[PDB]
């Protein structure tokens, strides 16, 4: 009943130990930039346990602002395998028989002329800027772009960052292009601003061409011309339902599976970077009275300025075990909620007839256009043109944040240094450039501007990790087996 069938040797015994790795890094950057603050290689079978402590010091404020700044911190796992196609060939998986003959080395990225600049992605990955002639393995720059494409990109208004999977070397860049230069280590990627009424608009009422019923143009009084069947009508209605479902939920394959079939599919199955953990917190603002006397052409005694000092604790930022070669990347970005001073709410335009007004019968109609007059009103023909599309009657579910009086930016003597509200020189278009966070609105509230090349933020990050790794406790020379 039993015969000898080969089986596993169980292999060698792998050592294991726990290691405490502290790490501290000091950074300076502006609002809206997605900044890598940590990276580590992870070998198969490691359990990583990570705590983060952060101390944020924004530039001092002219006055205490009537607005908030919010920090988001993110942790991700990127397998080397989804970044580089030759990873398996590298460890010896062969298409042919026996051993692999020529396995390409891990690809290199080469510094720009004069090296990378200050504030680039290479700078915050820990590549030393302004050092020409240096080259470095590129898989972590690829890993950064992969995380943007899987998570941070808006798939409706922009294309994805360029990501090369091949074994060829690449040329580093100092450029600010948000598509091509991300994997090249250039300026960081700028986060999109939070979902609100205007940031949630879409290019069309459906994702696709609008569905119509057919019209033939044939003439011999016109004979024939046929018509439309109830069956062709049912098809058209389902096509419109399909494209509208794609517009609401997103068309990524992880998104397709949830909206169409109601199914959660794992990120690792789909070759997406894995989300580990994250935290979100606003920053504290401490106001300082003026105790010096009033001087002519100066601020008076009792004036209030502000500073901002905030200590954020992230425990269990990463807790998990890893089954394959991967990188951990930790990201940080500072954003604020938006307020709008140049538009007029859509309800001020209703009342042409009774069908402009909300009714329960018109509850399930198609997505309706958001007019340009709502985001910026110019008093010209562009007011009634379309900015974007929102669900029907959404302005009755939303009241965008606003500013009135001397507080608004266009006033000749303006108090707008009290708040972060948007200001537009021209009519904004729904697009990739408008959807990005803007550091200039925060910048007019600061005593020392970033336009003067003062970084808006100075942060101290302290990392404490407990790593259970497949290494010996101490690595002491000399071998157990010969």
């Amino acid at each position: 009943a039993r015969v000898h069938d080969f089986s596993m040797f169980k292999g060698n015994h792998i050592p294991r130990s726990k290691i405490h790795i502290p790490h501290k890094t000091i950074r300076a950057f502006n609002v809206g930039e997605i900044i890598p603050i940590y990276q580590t290689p992870v070998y198969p079978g490691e359990h990583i346990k990570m705590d983060l402590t952060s101390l944020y010091r924004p530039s001092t404020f002219i006055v205490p602002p009537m607005d908030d700044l919010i920090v988001d911190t993110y942790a991700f796992a990127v397998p080397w395998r989804i970044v580089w196609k030759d990873l398996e060939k590298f460890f010896g998986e062969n298409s042919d028989s026996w051993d692999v003959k020529n396995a390409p080395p891990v690809p290199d990225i080469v510094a720009p002329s004069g090296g990378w600049d200050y504030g680039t992605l290479a700078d915050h990955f820990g590549i030393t800027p302004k050092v020409p002639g240096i080259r470095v393995k590129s898989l972590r720059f690829r890993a950064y772009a992969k995380i943007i494409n899987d998570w941070f990109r808006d798939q409706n208004l922009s294309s994805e960052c360029a990501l090369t999977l091949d074994s060829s070397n690449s040329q580093g860049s100092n450029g600010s292009n948000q598509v091509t230069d991300i994997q090249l280590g250039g300026k960081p990627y700028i986060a999109n601003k939070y979902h609100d009424y205007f940031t949630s608009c879409l290019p069309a009422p459906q994702k696709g061409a609008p569905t119509t019923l057919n019209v033939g143009g044939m003439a011999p009084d016109l004979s024939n011309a046929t018509g439309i069947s109830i069956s062709d009508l049912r098809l058209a209605i389902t096509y419109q339902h399909y494209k509208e479902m794609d517009a609401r939920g997103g068309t990524r394959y992880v998104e397709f599976t949830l909206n169409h079939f109601g199914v959660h599919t794992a990120d690792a199955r789909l070759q997406r970077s894995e989300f580990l953990g994250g935290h979100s917190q606003s920053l504290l603002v401490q106001s300082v009275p003026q105790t010096s006397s009033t001087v002519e052409k100066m601020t008076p005694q009792g004036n209030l300025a502000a500073f901002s000092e905030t200590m954020i604790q992230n425990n269990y930022l990463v807790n998990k075990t890893f089954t394959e070669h991967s990188y951990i990347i930790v990201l940080a970005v500072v954003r604020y909620k938006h307020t709008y001073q140049q538009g007029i709410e859509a309800d001020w335009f209703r009342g042409q007839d009774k069908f402009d007004m909300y009714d329960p019968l018109l509850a399930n109609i198609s997505e309706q256009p958001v007019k340009n007059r709502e985001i910026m009103v110019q008093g010209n023909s562009q007011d009634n043109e379309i900015f974007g599309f929102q669900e029907a009657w959404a302005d009755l579910r939303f009241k965008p944040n606003s500013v009135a009086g001397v507080m608004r930016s266009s006033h000749p003597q303006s108090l707008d240094y009290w708040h972060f509200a948007d200001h537009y020189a021209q009519l904004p278009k729904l697009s990739s450039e408008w959807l990005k966070e803007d550091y200039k609105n925060v910048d007019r509230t600061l005593a020392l501007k970033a336009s003067d090349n003062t970084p808006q933020l100075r942060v101290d990050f302290m990392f404490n990790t407990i790593a259970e790794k497949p290494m010996p406790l101490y690595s002491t020379p000399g071998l157990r087996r010969i």
């Binding site: 205490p64 602002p65 009537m66 607005d67 908030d68 919010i70 988001d72 993110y74 998570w151 941070f152 990109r153 808006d154 798939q155 409706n156 986060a191 999109n192 979902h195 949630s200 879409l202 517009a247 609401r248 939920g249 997103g250 068309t251 990524r252 992880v254 998104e255 949830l258 909206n259 989300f275 953990g277 994250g278 935290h279 979100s280 917190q281 606003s282 504290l284 603002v285 401490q286 106001s287 300082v288 502000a306 669900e391």
Partner: peptide, 30 residues
């Protein structure tokens, strides 16, 4: 009830939160 810190700058308060993957309008973006 009346006296409070040097910490008041706005009417609106923001609560700290754990971040979770979500599917808002138009696909995932953080």
């Amino acid at each position: 009830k009346r006296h409070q810190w040097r910490l008041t700058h706005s009417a609106r308060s923001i609560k700290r939160a754990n971040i979770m993957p979500s599917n808002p309008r138009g696909g995932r973006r953080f």
